[PDB]
């Protein structure tokens, strides 16, 4: 504590969080970026926004935050506030309506070698195209593009920590199953600025919907109405209740439309399979 | 020694972010404005709100932050927090939720020659009076009005940005490769205009703003499949009542009044979607 107090006072006596933490301005700050998916909160088909709970692990070296443990009682690692130090400004480029950057400023683990590890939490509300063609049997490949907003690849380089996101602490989802996940790095250089590449890391998740809820709540009543539709042709005309049966099946389907709109998403990107079945049943009646 | 630190101390040791970068009070600061739209999230008919994801391209000159790359080891760009530099304070005047400023205060890029670039991203919820007459086969004219919350036209003025070809970007910029069209709305046009008013002697100090008019077209597929076609068929069913016999077992009044009941159910359904 006294050793760490003295060390922190020495470190932040003339520290600057404005400039990049490099010995020479011609050096590059390498940032190892690792995304951990903790939870898949929601998939919004109407607004095309996937909400996730993530830990965005970031690792980089700070040249000025170095010390010898022998001069400070053997202190080899410490925790300091992240707001006091320079950090990369990773931004979710496909942010729909959430936060673009990190807002929860947790503490960084600082090694005596200058190595920083910062693992803040974030709620990523990301915008991805939601193909509803095969709904509720639909598969959705949704990506999260991450990159340094104000720094280019020539001054700050970013690399993935691993080829795949960390799903070790992922909570089981009751609506989606993550079939595949992969983190790809991309570099784009423009002819106007040939010496300043712009880098990003895009994590994509291929997810398959679990359709039992919609099968039980939507498909089975529609099947029952479809079966009941043809029974009027076995009902004799002398009963005087043919129109009663047919029009009341129509009334039941019309009331069930309220449940249909309540349950399924409402979007005009395409006609869902469940919507096609609803329209088929209605034309049938 | 990092040369970035030396440049930062040279520029910012004697610098006031509260003062405009003008040598005289009556000089005007010119702001080059570009607005890039990333995603059109939603248009809430009930609240009459348009939610969009944008980032604003802001460029201007600051003679106080002017440096030569030769003197400072060849540095052509410097990233500093936006709170340390003067800003024109561009706000969305027609926001409906009370959020005027940008979502993330990104760093400003200070280039050599006094050129300052700021590219902050923003989420805006703007007023859009929904023209309900032809709903759902309707198009809207949502506006995004940008202005300086502090400075008048004589103090700060706006100009449109120019691309590498040199033409003026008098519209909303959209990156085609990165743009995913909204599921319900298609953006057709997006002109931009710089307006000036209150500039008369009787009016007093002049005022200016930039207005972007998003012309958006609704895709009526959901309403066509789910509401209009079933309602049309059910409303056509009453014509079948003319062919049923006028006897006890005809069920003529059965078919007619139950079609009315289904129409009432559709009224309840439609009341949840239409504007108020």
């Amino acid at each position, epitope marked *: 504590s006294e050793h760490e107090t003295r060390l922190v006072a020495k470190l932040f006596k003339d520290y600057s969080s404005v400039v990049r933490p490099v010995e*020479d301005h*011609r050096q590059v700050v*390498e940032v190892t970026v690792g995304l951990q998916l903790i939870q898949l909160i929601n998939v919004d088909e109407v607004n095309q926004i996937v909400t996730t709970n993530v830990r965005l692990k970031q690792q980089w*070296v700070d040249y000025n935050l170095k010390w010898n443990p022998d001069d400070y009682g053997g202190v080899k690692k410490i925790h300091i506030p992240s707001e006091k130090i320079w950090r990369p400004d990773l931004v979710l480029y496909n942010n729909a309506d959430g936060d673009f950057a990190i807002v929860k400023f947790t503490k960084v683990l600082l090694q005596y*070698t200058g190595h920083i590890t910062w693992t803040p939490p974030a709620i990523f509300k990301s915008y991805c195209e939601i193909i509803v063609t095969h709904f509720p049997f639909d598969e959705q490949n949704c990506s999260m593009k991450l990159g340094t907003w104000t720094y280019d690849g020539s001054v700050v380089a970013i690399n993935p920590e691993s080829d795949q996101p960390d799903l070790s602490n992922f909570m089981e989802s009751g609506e989606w199953v993550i079939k595949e996940s992969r983190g790809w790095k991309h570099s784009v250089t423009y002819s106007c600025c040939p010496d300043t590449p712009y880098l990003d890391i895009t994590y994509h998740f291929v997810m398959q919907r679990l359709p039992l809820y919609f099968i039980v709540n939507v498909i089975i009543p529609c099947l029952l109405f479809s079966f009941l539709t043809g029974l009027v042709f076995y009902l004799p005309t002398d009963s005087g209740e043919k129109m009663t049966l047919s029009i009341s099946v129509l009334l039941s389907l019309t009331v069930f439309l309220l449940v249909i709109v309540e349950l399924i998403p409402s979007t005009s990107s395409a006609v869902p399979l469940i919507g096609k079945y609803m329209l088929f049943t209605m034309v049938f009646v | 020694k990092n040369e970035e630190l030396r440049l930062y101390h040279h520029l910012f040791n004697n610098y006031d972010p509260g003062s405009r970068p003008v040598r005289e009070p009556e000089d005007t600061v010119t702001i080059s404005l570009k607005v890039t739209l990333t995603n059109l999230i939603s248009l809430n008919e009930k609240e009459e709100t348009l939610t969009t994801s944008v980032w604003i391209g802001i460029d201007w000159q600051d003679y106080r932050l002017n440096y030569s790359k*030769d003197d400072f080891g*060849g540095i052509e760009t410097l990233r500093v927090p936006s709170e340390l530099v003067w800003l024109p304070e561009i706000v969305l005047e027609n926001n409906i939720d009370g959020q005027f400023g940008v979502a993330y205060d990104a760093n400003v890029l200070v280039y050599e020659g006094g050129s300052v670039t700021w590219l902050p991203p923003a989420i805006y919820r703007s007023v859009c009076a929904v023209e309900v007459t032809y709903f759902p086969f309707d198009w809207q004219n949502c506006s995004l009005i940008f202005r300086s919350q502090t400075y008048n036209a004589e103090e700060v003025e706006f100009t449109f940005a120019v691309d590498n070809d040199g033409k003026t970007i008098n519209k909303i910029d959209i990156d085609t490769e990165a743009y995913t069209e909204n599921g319900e709305w298609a953006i057709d046009f997006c002109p931009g205009v710089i307006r000036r008013h209150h500039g008369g002697a009787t009016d007093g100090p002049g005022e200016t703003d930039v207005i972007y008019s998003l012309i958006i077209r609704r895709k009526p597929l959901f309403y066509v499949i789910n509401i209009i076609v079933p309602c049309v068929l059910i409303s056509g069913l009453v014509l079948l009542a003319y062919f049923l016999p006028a006897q006890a077992g005809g069920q003529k009044c059965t078919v007619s009044i139950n079609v009315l009941l289904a129409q009432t159910v559709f009224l309840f359904l439609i009341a949840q979607k239409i504007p108020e």
Partner: antibody
Amino acid sequence: QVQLVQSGAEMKKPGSSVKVSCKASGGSFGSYGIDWVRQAPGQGLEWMGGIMPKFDAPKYAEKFQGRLTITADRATNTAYMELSSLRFEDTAIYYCARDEQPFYDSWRGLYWGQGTLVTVSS
Amino acid sequence: DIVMTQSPLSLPVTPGEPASISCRSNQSLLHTKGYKYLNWYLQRPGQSPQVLIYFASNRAPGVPDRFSGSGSGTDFTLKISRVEAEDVGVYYCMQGLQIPFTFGPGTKVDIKR
């Protein structure tokens, strides 16, 4: 103090492959800032290859293309080289030169390994 | 490849008086941003090489203040304020601009007697 420790000396024959490591301690190193330099007996230094952020991939000399593979592991703070199809003239002391923070389009080599003698002889 | 040469091939020195080494390239090493990519390396007898000056003017961390460097687009110089007994070895100049990077033939140094 930052120290680079290379693998041990190796005795090889023509046509075989030698893999030399370069392990770092006392500091943190990344995916870039690695260069391998050999010194034959009674001859000067010669650059073999390395990794720079400009290319994001290793670049080798014309002599070593197809035979040399250079890699750097950020997680374990070590780098490797793998030279295949060894010849008699490849006998030399092989060094690793590294920088904690790499330069974009060049290299400096502030920290050097102790050098490993690879002797190719039948 | 860019050809790099140094002079003198062998320089006797006495401790307590300055010294100078020179290196020359067959192409201008000037970068577009305005700095010259030329590094100097010292290999003491039996030890690994040590960087002395990088980019032709910058003293590396941990290097004594004696070693200084300067140069132009094609000609570069390395100077020692006052030679010490520990400064004996082979000095190499290296360009870091164009792949393949090339070291010089190397300049030898020894105590004069």
